[PDB]
Amino acid sequence: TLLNPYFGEFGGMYVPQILMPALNQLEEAFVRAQKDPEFQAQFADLLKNYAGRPTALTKCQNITAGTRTTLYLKREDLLHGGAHKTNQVLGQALLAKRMGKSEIIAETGAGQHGVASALASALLGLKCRIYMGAKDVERQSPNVFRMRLMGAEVIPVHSGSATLKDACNEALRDWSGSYETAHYMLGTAAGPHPYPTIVREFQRMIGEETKAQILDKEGRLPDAVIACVGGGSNAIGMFADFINDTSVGLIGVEPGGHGIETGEHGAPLKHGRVGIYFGMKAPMMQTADGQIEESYSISAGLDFPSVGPQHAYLNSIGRADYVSITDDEALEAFKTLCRHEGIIPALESSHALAHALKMMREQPEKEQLLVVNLSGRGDKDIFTVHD
Amino acid sequence: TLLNPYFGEFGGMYVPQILMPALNQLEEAFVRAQKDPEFQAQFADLLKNYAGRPTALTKCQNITAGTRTTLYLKREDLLHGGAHKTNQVLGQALLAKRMGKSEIIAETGAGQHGVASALASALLGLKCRIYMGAKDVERQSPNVFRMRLMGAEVIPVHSGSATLKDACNEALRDWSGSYETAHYMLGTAAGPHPYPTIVREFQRMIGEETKAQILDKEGRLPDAVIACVGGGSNAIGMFADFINDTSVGLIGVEPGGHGIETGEHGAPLKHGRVGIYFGMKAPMMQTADGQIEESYSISAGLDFPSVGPQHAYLNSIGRADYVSITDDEALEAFKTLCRHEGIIPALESSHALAHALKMMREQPEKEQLLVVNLSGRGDKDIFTVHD
Amino acid sequence: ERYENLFAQLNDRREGAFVPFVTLGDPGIEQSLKIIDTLIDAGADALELGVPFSDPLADGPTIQNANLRAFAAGVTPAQCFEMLALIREKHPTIPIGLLMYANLVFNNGIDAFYARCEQVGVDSVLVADVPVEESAPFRQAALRHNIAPIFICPPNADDDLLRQVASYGRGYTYLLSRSGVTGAENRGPLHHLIEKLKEYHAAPALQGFGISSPEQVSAAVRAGAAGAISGSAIVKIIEKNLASPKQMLAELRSFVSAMKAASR
Amino acid sequence: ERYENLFAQLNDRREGAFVPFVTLGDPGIEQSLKIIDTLIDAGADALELGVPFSDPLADGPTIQNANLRAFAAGVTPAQCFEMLALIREKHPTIPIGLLMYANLVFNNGIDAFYARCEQVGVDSVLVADVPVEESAPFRQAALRHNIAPIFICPPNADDDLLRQVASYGRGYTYLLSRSGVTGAENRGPLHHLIEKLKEYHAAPALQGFGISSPEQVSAAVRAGAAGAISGSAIVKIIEKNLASPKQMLAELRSFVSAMKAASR
Ligand SMILES: O=P(O)(O)/C=C/CCSc1cc(F)ccc1O
Ligand SMILES: O=P(O)(O)/C=C/CCSc1cc(F)ccc1O
Ligand SMILES: *Cc1c(COP(=O)(O)O)cnc(C)c1O
Ligand SMILES: *Cc1c(COP(=O)(O)O)cnc(C)c1O
Ligand code: NA
Ligand code: NA
């Protein structure tokens, strides 16, 4: 391959032989795109004039009153679509187009990636096919209608546990037979190479913008940048530009569900076991017999039962640290931001905020410059948090 | 007064004697604020770093294919909160603060102004009181929960028709007794002076940004700028900077409901009668006996039964032109933008888009540079458009 | 000059004026006509009559409901003028003031509304939502048809306002005892205003808002005001006895006799 | 060397190999054991056995349901190895290949899984989600425990792949007749590959995917392939007759006899 498929022991290309030429094709189109100033200029224009780039960096004064912490939030919730997921799908769509592809295959759990894939395809003139577990379809009627209204075909998968896992399966099944006309738009920084590398690169703007932004407003790099970890895309996007800045701490937050000790959580990188699945070698929600299991969380969007290979790797060498936050903990942070800052955060992002809040509260006299990545909007979670 | 309360024959200050000193106070604080570089710098910082200013200007290529029209959309749907309403409430909140006020009184129909007033108060540390007709409260549970979650007090008004009209009444009743500690945050460019002038001025950024933006991208001013008219705030904000540019057409769109001819509409400026109500002289939804009536529309947010005085005036001298769009017409434009551009527009804004679409379709060979003000997001209308 | 005559008369009796308020058509036309005669018979010196309006932004719940009850009966503004004529054809000297909101008088011409008031025998008109700054056209029209334009003097009026009110008003000066809206639900020192108004030769002052007890009217008189207006306390008796009309009139009598006695 | 012996034997008979597939434990353990003996008795030359996995991303609905039915019966991977041992203790010469997914063999050590295969009498192992680029550890472990590592040759393999497959594989070369996933639901010219594989001294090729009729196996043999594999067509007969076990076995017999006859 032209690039390294592994991040230490993690990563790889574990797909049937039939899909290997599809992956080599994609990789090569990416290396070229990345060198093409015309691709770069087009990607840039779409981000600025269509998505709302650059997003703001907001100082939270009320929330940190009476402590020595200075908290700022990356305004990814202000991006068109309500989440960070939008940056990514635009680039991938431009890649599909570059390859001569006219069809898009998508995977979605909570619905967010589905909506983002659907909007990118409508804008760029691509036919979108989306796989959703029958359970999730029933559970997420609003996003399903949004998807269809945007011209996308929604297909319920009733196999297995009828959720994200099974949606991921049906998509590869489809792709193994249509790779010549269709391009698979993977939704996170995981899966077989070159997806983990491509998703990071197309999500890099985040930390890049945050750097200049904090440098302007404070004339210093932050002490730490925090982000939730479902599959790893928003987290790695924040991290990337700061990896070579050794003084900046990188903290990822995984869903703790009802509590790690109950086994009812979604924290594989820290409380799971390394396995091989979804074209990848990485930590996973697994039974003792190696049967792939489900991840649980109050937020539907942190359901991916595995995690990005670059995260497992940054953890092993000690570059980044990972922690977890329970359902009740994420609810508290949701409530607090609404009340003191007037911002309604996604229950996903709330996990990241909750940790920043703990960092403060636990050591209020500690001088600290923190940046939380507010990866999305919480209008979606009003009824959930209400019942 | 320091400024003119009238726009020709329209406008005024028709409130009980007891509220007159409150209005003179507000006016004077506004004249001062407007001269204060420190107020200006604070207002600017809040718009940029908290609200997401400047918003994008998006070219809609797919939608205008095969015609000679070039359409661009002002991305007000990308503002924090999902609507233009946010710019306004921040300024008014800073004004209340400047006056030594610590309490906010608010009026809301569909819920948008309620949410915007609630968020501004949470950020700026003000106690918010909100009046909502019992009918609207029941009809808008999501916004009511959003409001409360943001620390605001929601109060159902059961008097009269229990809708916007009656909410507007209870607020003035309250204000007539609390003006010494509380400030009334009016939600549109209407009501007694100085509200129509203040709301415009705090909504001016829109057209100001649009000018520079179109000048950069096309090196020419637009042929026409279009905007929906519920009460008039988003429309006037777009218009303002272009008023002295005689070659630029200004078009306002009023809800036609089931059709003007059925009497089931919300177009007073063009199909109502001049009356005196809500501290103002202006066109109004009225019975033959002068009893104030209700405005109807598929979009709940275009319910205000009257209209801003500056609009009635711009219409009389021929500077601006006003038209209407029916329910079915607004639904079509909603569907079309989702499908061809991947943007979900509020049913409010859809009325403006629908007219721009007619302008094109009716005369496809006409060269035209158009700008529609996309005043808000349509996630809110998914279920409505679905049933 | 109905007000002028009444006041000179009351002064010759070293007496204050007791003015009750009701909404025309509440709980019904016929019953309303009956309530009004009972009011006068029990001692009312003058009358303040509100015509049903959809958005009374200067009124509390009690009076808000009076408008609603009238609407439920189907009372229209045209039906109101018919009622007014009959009341005058029955009572020739009693001053009659109308409580109005802006749209109802501007609706089909400001001039024509005042002309209709003259033709019916109305004495004064207070438009609750028109401040002095906006009264010119209403003032002029009223004067032209021999109708007295009533101006409101708030408890916080500065010299400039006092001088304006004194100069433009006629019939009586509406001395607002409180801030807020109408309502006997909550009570309400006007000596300073009363003296200054007298100094600028203003029309005699009638204190209104929150007056609901005998002691309250005696106090108004002692302060120097020529009388007092009471609405919620009156309308509340109507609300209370809707199922027993006879009970209404009987209780309506006792209250206004007590209130009248307090102005002596 | 079970495969080597079988193929040399079949060649001496100028015959092709007919290899049926089933999921271990579908519809139940006991019934599965019964289906397998019926398969062999009716003429099967070798066997391809899949152990129940939660996410079979290379399988169509038919086989997806076989895994689900097995799961419903409570068949575990440990229970699978117990089944395999009994099958060998009963049939000593028949080649047995396992259809596997990556996690099940890596789960508790790659080495230990292959050691268990040896101890049970398994002959080959195909890991559906491990391409040549990632096979090193699986290849090495298999060879170390005398298990043949099965490599897949897609219909679009370039020279570099053909050479790699020929060099690393053993037992048999899995010639994919189609693109997509398993399923007799839709049918599928491999002459070029077959010749090149023979040129590079690859293990004998078995054509798999979409083979569901007698004519299909005769065609595979005519092309130059040493035999054919059929799964969906077999599993479909099990699905059809779940309520009548006896009916299942009887119909299972007729199909594989017909298919076997076609390789002569
Ligand atoms: O109910 P209360 O407090 O006794 C007051 C009676 C009603 C007097 S008439 C009036 C005057 C205004 F300036 C505004 C509204 C009105 O209804
Ligand atoms: O159903 P069909 O088309 O007849 C195919 C039968 C199953 C052969 S064994 C196998 C091999 C693979 F490469 C992937 C999945 C599998 O189950
Ligand atoms: C889509 C989604 C996620 C899950 O994220 P990964 O970055 O890929 O882990 C997180 N937050 C929000 C708001 C999301 O919509
Ligand atoms: C609040 C609201 C309106 C009504 O608007 P005015 O500008 O004051 O007429 C229009 N559009 C949207 C999206 C709104 O939320
Ligand atoms: Na995960
Ligand atoms: Na309107």
Cα distances (Å, whole numbers) of residue C65 to A355, C102, D144: 54, 20, 95
C30: CB partners within 8 A, 6+ apart: none
Distance from CA of A189 to the nearest CA of B (A): 24
CB contact under 8 A, B78 and A75: no
Chain B residues interacting with chain A (CB cutoff of 8 angstroms): 48-52, 55-59, 62, 75, 78, 80, 82, 118-123, 125, 142, 145-146, 149-151, 335, 338-344, 379, 382-383, 385-386
CB contact under 8 A, B342 and A123: yes
Q: How many CA atoms lie within 13 A of A361 on its CB side?
A: 8
Pair of tokens at residue B153 = 């007090």
Q: Do chains C and D touch (3 or more CB pairs under 8 A)?
A: no
Q: Within a 10 A sphere around the Cβ of A141, how many other Cβ atoms?
A: 13
Q: What is the DSSP letter of B259?
A: B
Query: Is residue A1 included in any domain, yes or no?
Result: no
B318: CB partners within 8 A, 6+ apart: none
- CA dist C261 and A158 (Å) reads 86
Which of left, alpha, beta for D146 (phi over 0: left; psi -120 to 50: alpha)? left
Backbone φ, ψ for residue B21 (5° rounding):
-65, -25
Burial degree of A321 (CB within 10 A; 0-12, 13-18, 19+): middle
- CA dist A205 and A220 (Å) reads 19
- CA dist A85 and A89 (Å) reads 7
User: Between β-strands C173-176 and C152-153, what pairing exists: parallel, antiparallel or unpaired?
Assistant: parallel
Pair of tokens at residue C83 = 């009622």
What is the per-residue DSSP string for A315-381? Answer: HHTTSEEEEEEEHHHHHHHHHHHHHHH---B-TTHHHHHHHHHHHHHHSTTS-EEEEEEE-BB-GGG
Q: What angle do CA C218, C224, C230 make, to 5 degrees?
A: 50
Cα distances (Å, whole numbers) of residue D56 to A29, C42, D135, D150, D184: 29, 95, 19, 18, 16
**Is B84 part of the annotated catalytic residue set?**
yes
What is the per-residue DSSP string for A58-112? Answer: EE-TTTTTTSSEEEEEEEGGGSTTSBTHHHHHHHHHHHHHHTT--EEEEE-SSSH
Q: Where are the beta strands (DSSP E) in chain D?
A: 17-23, 47-50, 96-100, 124-127, 148-149, 152-153, 173-176, 205-208, 227-230
Dist. CA D65 → ligand 5 center (Å): 27
Q: What angle do CA A233, A79, B46 make, to 5 degrees?
A: 125
Burial degree of A142 (CB within 10 A; 0-12, 13-18, 19+): middle
- CA dist A12 and A207 (Å) reads 26
Which of left, alpha, beta for B172 (phi over 0: left; psi -120 to 50: alpha)? alpha
Is the domain of A189 the same as that of A271?
A: no
Q: B70 forms bridges with which residues in the sheet?
A: B369
**Is A84 part of the annotated catalytic residue set?**
yes
User: Between β-strands C96-100 and C124-127, what pairing exists: parallel, antiparallel or unpaired?
Assistant: parallel
Dist. CA A187 → ligand 3 center (Å): 9
CB contact under 8 A, B149 and A382: yes
Nearest alpha-carbon partner for B252 in B273, B265, B276, B234: B234
Backbone φ, ψ for residue D48 (5° rounding):
-120, 115
Comparing CB atoms, the residue among C59, C107, C179 nearest residue B177 is: C179
Tell the residue number behind the tokens 């395999």, with chain if given.
Answer: D84
Dist. CA A105 → ligand 6 center (Å): 45
Report helix, strand or coil for C32: helix
CB contact under 8 A, A386 and B145: yes
Handedness of CA A338, A344, A349, A350 (dihedral sign): positive
Segment holding C230, helix H or strand E: strand C227-230
Q: What is the DSSP letter of D204?
A: P
Distance from CA of B1 to the nearest CA of C (A): 10
Is the domain of B164 the same as that of B183?
A: yes
Report helix, strand or coil for B161: coil
Which of left, alpha, beta for A14 (phi over 0: left; psi -120 to 50: alpha)? beta
* Ligand 1 binding site (Cβ under 6 Å of any ligand atom): C 21, 48, 50, 58-59, 63, 99, 126, 128, 152, 182-184, 208-211, 229-232
- CA dist A170 and D134 (Å) reads 23
Is the domain of B157 the same as that of B56?
A: no
Query: Is residue B186 included in any domain, yes or no?
Result: yes
Pair of tokens at residue A147 = 């998807």
Domain end marker among A158, A188, A203: A203
Domain, as residue range, for D131: 1-264
Tell the residue number behind the tokens 């600028």, with chain if given.
Answer: C200
Q: B105 forms bridges with which residues in the sheet?
A: B129, B184
Torsion of CA A159, A162, A163, A166, to 10 degrees: 0
Nearest alpha-carbon partner for B89 in B56, B122, B57, B54: B122
CB contact under 8 A, A176 and D107: no
Nearest alpha-carbon partner for A192 in A21, A381, A332: A21
Cα D262 to chain centroid, rounded: 19
How many residues appear in chain D?
Answer: 264
Q: A131 forms bridges with which residues in the sheet?
A: A107, A155
Nearest alpha-carbon partner for C119 in C148, C94, C146, C92: C146
Q: How many CA atoms lie within 13 A of A148 on its CB side?
A: 14
Query: Is residue B24 included in any domain, yes or no?
Result: yes
Cis? peptide before D52, omega within 30° of 0 = no
Nearest alpha-carbon partner for D7 in D45, D48, D49: D45
Is the domain of A268 the same as that of A238?
A: yes
Is the domain of A38 the same as that of A59?
A: no
Query: Is residue A136 included in any domain, yes or no?
Result: yes
- CA dist B30 and B38 (Å) reads 13
Tell the residue number behind the tokens 């309303």, with chain if given.
Answer: C32
Q: Which of B73, B78, B85 to mutate to test the pocket of ligand 4 (most atoms within 8 A of CB)?
A: B85
Query: Is residue B2 included in any domain, yes or no?
Result: no
Is the domain of B273 the same as that of B181?
A: no
Ligand positioned closest to the Cα atom of A304: 5
Number of domains present in the structure of chain A: 2
User: Between β-strands C17-23 and B279-284, what pairing exists: parallel, antiparallel or unpaired?
Assistant: unpaired
Chain A residues interacting with chain B (CB cutoff of 8 angstroms): 48-52, 55-59, 62, 75, 78, 80, 82, 118-123, 125, 142, 145-146, 149-151, 335, 338-344, 379, 382-383, 385-386
Is the domain of A111 the same as that of A146?
A: yes
The CATH number of the domain holding residue D85 is 3.20.20.70
Domain, as residue range, for A269: 52-84+204-387
Is the domain of A97 the same as that of A215?
A: no
Is the domain of A187 the same as that of A256?
A: no
Q: Which of B164, B233, B325, B373 to mutate to test the pocket of ligand 4 (most atoms within 8 A of CB)?
A: B233
- CA dist A114 and D26 (Å) reads 35
Burial degree of A234 (CB within 10 A; 0-12, 13-18, 19+): buried
Pocket flag, ligand 3, residue A253 (CB < 6 Å)? no
- CA dist C53 and B166 (Å) reads 12
Residue type, C92: P
Is the domain of B62 the same as that of B44?
A: no
Is the domain of A141 the same as that of A238?
A: no
> Three-state secondary structure along B291-340?
CECCCCCCCHHHCCCCCCHHHHHHHHCCCEEEEEEEHHHHHHHHHHHHHH
Is the domain of B11 the same as that of B155?
A: yes
Report helix, strand or coil for D257: helix
- CA dist D80 and D62 (Å) reads 20
Number of domains present in the structure of chain D: 1
Cα distances (Å, whole numbers) of residue C91 to A149, B346, C12: 71, 60, 22
Per the CB < 8 A criterion, the answer to whether A378 and A330 are in contact is no
Which contacts of B20-24 are long-range, i.e. CB under 8 A and separated by 24 or more positions?
B20/C131, B20/C133, B21/B179, B21/C156, B22/B175, B22/B179, B22/B184, B23/B192, B23/B193, B23/B194
Per the CB < 8 A criterion, the answer to whether C117 and C126 are in contact is no
Pair of tokens at residue B129 = 């009181």
Q: Give every strand in the sheet of C96-100, ordered side by side.
A: C148-149, C124-127, C96-100, C47-50, C17-23, C227-230, C205-208, C173-176, C152-153
Query: Is residue B248 included in any domain, yes or no?
Result: yes
The CATH number of the domain holding residue A23 is 3.40.50.1100
Query: Is residue A2 included in any domain, yes or no?
Result: no
Which residue precedes each gap in chain A (C to N above 2.5 Å)? none
Nearest alpha-carbon partner for C145 in C186, C110, C102: C110
Per the CB < 8 A criterion, the answer to whether A192 and A279 are in contact is yes
Nearest alpha-carbon partner for B377 in B152, B88, B73: B73
Pair of tokens at residue B177 = 């007794």
